Nucleic acid binder design. Structure first.
Length: 166
DNA sequence: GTAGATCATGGAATATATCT
């Protein structure tokens, strides 16, 4: 069907950050079709067509629910409070690297508490060479990434905005 | 009712005789 969202690497207006975000979209949708191969498991019956340098999106019904499902599935938080990005393969990533990436992302992206609410400081004593070093980190509860869908879509029409967004 | 100012909210070589 017609693309409500069209994205190409060859577009002139894009910058480097837009391209790396495009790659992030590509990998998270790859991991989603690995997790949800079938159409009706995908919220809002989203359908993505992926090429070497193009990502293509169609869905059914109102946009708000579709992007809400996409965002909620994309960014998640495990029980330990660490970041859970489906684009990266968390299964074969150990807990130390998970702590590394979570600490990095709160230290560079979520640098401000106006965008995220943190949990309790969770300390775990991981065992290396008969040494239980206590890894101490601040767990999270919510962040603006999980709820950017409200800003992305119009409030009244529950559809994507047709103007520039601050 | 809205725009500007304020406040919260952060993680842990010479002389001499001679010729003319």
């Amino acid at each position: 069907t017609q693309p409500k969202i069209s994205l190409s690497l060859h577009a002139a207006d894009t910058t480097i950050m837009h391209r790396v975000g495009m790659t992030g979209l590509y990998m998270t949708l790859k991991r989603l079709e690995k997790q949800y191969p079938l159409s009706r498991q995908r919220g809002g019956h989203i359908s993505w067509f992926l090429t070497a340098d193009t990502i293509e999106l169609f869905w059914e019904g109102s946009d708000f629910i579709a992007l809400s499902w996409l965002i909620n599935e994309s960014f998640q938080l495990d029980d330990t409070g660490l970041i859970h990005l489906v684009g990266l393969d968390n299964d074969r990533i150990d807990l130390r690297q998970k702590i590394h990436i979570h600490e990095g992302i709160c230290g560079v992206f979520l640098r401000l508490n106006k965008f995220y609410q943190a949990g309790e400081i969770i300390n775990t004593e991981l065992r290396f060479e008969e040494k239980q070093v206590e890894y101490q980190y601040k767990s999270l509860t919510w962040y603006a990434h999980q709820t950017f869908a409200e800003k992305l879509c119009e409030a009244d029409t529950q559809q994507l905005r047709h103007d520039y967004i601050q």
